[PDB]
């Protein structure tokens, strides 16, 4: 097995998938690393099961079908695995806590939202359909470049949006276009 953490790419108190070389922090993994079940298989092997039983659940989709689909296990463990790729990159540090909003000529969004806030979200079982997750993580992206403007820092916004939504388009298999 691997000796990092594969989200957050430190070492420390690791448990380690039975059935692929990654290892997890308990709290990195999405869901947190079950109390026991020996073998355990981390999510991205929970996740290439689904496809492996049903093949054709790689065909492609239409986005909007995607949203509309009830938070029934499989599609609950999805949302688990996108929050968690967005969750493997660096820079979603900047979205993961709960932010304030002090800038001079910029006024804090109506509704504020942060990686952490989902991810209990998810945890509580909060979101009946896909696209309550999925409103909710574009809006993290969409109130920071509103409350950044011109400020290059903008930029950071886009970069993770473009993790998630890849992700996104990977992960429920929506339709290739140009
Ligand atoms: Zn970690
Ligand atoms: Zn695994
Ligand atoms: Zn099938």
Same mark, same amino acid.
């Given at each position: 097995n ?11 108190r ?9 290892? /997890?922090?308990? =709290? ?15 999510? $991205? ?15 492609? =989709? ?25 969750? #493997?990159?660096?820079?979603? #540090? /900047? /979205? ?8 001079? @000529?910029?006024? @804090? ?13 998810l ?8 696209? @309550? $997750? ?6 993290? /992206? =969409?109130? =920071? ?16 949006q473009?993790?998630?939504?890849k992700?996104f ?10």
């Open positions: 691997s000796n990092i953490c594969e989200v957050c790419n430190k070492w420390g690791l448990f380690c998938c039975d059935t692929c070389p990654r290892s /997890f922090h308990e =709290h990195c993994h999405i869901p947190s690393v079950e109390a026991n079940k020996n073998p355990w298989s981390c999510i $991205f092997c929970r996740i290439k099961t689904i496809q492996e039983r049903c093949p054709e659940s790689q065909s492609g =989709h239409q986005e909007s079908e995607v949203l509309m689909r009830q938070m029934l296990p499989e599609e609950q463990l999805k949302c688990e695995f996108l929050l968690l790729k967005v969750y #493997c990159d660096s820079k979603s #540090c /900047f /979205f993961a806590s709960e932010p304030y909003y002090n800038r001079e @000529g910029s006024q @804090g969004p109506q509704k504020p939202m942060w990686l952490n806030k989902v991810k209990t979200s945890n509580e079982q909060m979101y009946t359909r896909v696209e @309550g $997750f999925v409103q909710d993580m574009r809006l993290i /992206f =969409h109130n =920071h470049k509103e409350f950044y403007r011109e400020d290059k820092f903008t930029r950071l916004g886009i970069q993770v473009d993790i998630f939504e992700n388009r990977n992960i429920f298999a929506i339709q290739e276009t140009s």
